């Protein structure tokens, strides 16, 4: 049960195969729910399933 910058939620986190842009935080779906985040205090990028 994660909480990233106040956005709670549930899922399994894993390392990203994606290439992330250095101003963004959140990758968002057609379903309009978070799919990919960046750590609020680390530079690693995590895919949310």
């Amino acid at each position: 049960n994660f909480n990233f910058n106040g956005l709670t939620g549930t899922g399994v986190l894993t390392e990203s195969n994606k290439k992330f842009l250095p101003f963004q935080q959140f990758g968002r779906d057609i379903a309009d729910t978070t799919d990919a985040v960046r750590d609020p205090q680390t530079l690693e990028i995590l895919d949310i399933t």
Partner: protein, 206 residues
Amino acid sequence: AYTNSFTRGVYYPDKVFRSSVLHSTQDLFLPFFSNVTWFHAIHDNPVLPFNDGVYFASTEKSNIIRGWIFGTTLDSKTQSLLIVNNATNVVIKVCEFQFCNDPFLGVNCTFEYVSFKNLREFVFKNIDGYFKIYSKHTPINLVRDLPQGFSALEPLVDLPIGINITRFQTLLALHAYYVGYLQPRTFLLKYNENGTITDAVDCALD
């Protein structure tokens, strides 16, 4: 003077990642295949208004331009925002400043911040007390006009500031920039596999 604003008036509208999807959005944009007013660096500093954001660019590689001037009267009696290039740090300051009819570097503060074969394409926009600065440094080989081709400005800086801006100037130096205006448009954005914009469509063009 006028040239054709081909397609390089486009940027990422938000800080939200997407990949391999065509996402409609609406934001301020420079409309495709409209005019963009052109000017020349001589030795002047012509008077330009700030209208719901501004597109700016300069074909240069030698930094004749030293920075930018933003304000609303420019007489040390308003809170005018200034950008200056030190050649070490793009510095932004928000203080009342004394200006003339040829103010530049050549041969009550409330903010401090320390940061031709190339187009140094920049976009500035002021909304809800946010002053957002975008950029791109791209290679070319032509010089008279911006070429046919695609480019995607990325954000560099989000300064929240909160002063009114409705006019601007720009710095020259003693030792051929462009300008256009953004307006409300619905746009379609094609994020690719990498998550970078590659092409877009101005929904109300034709």
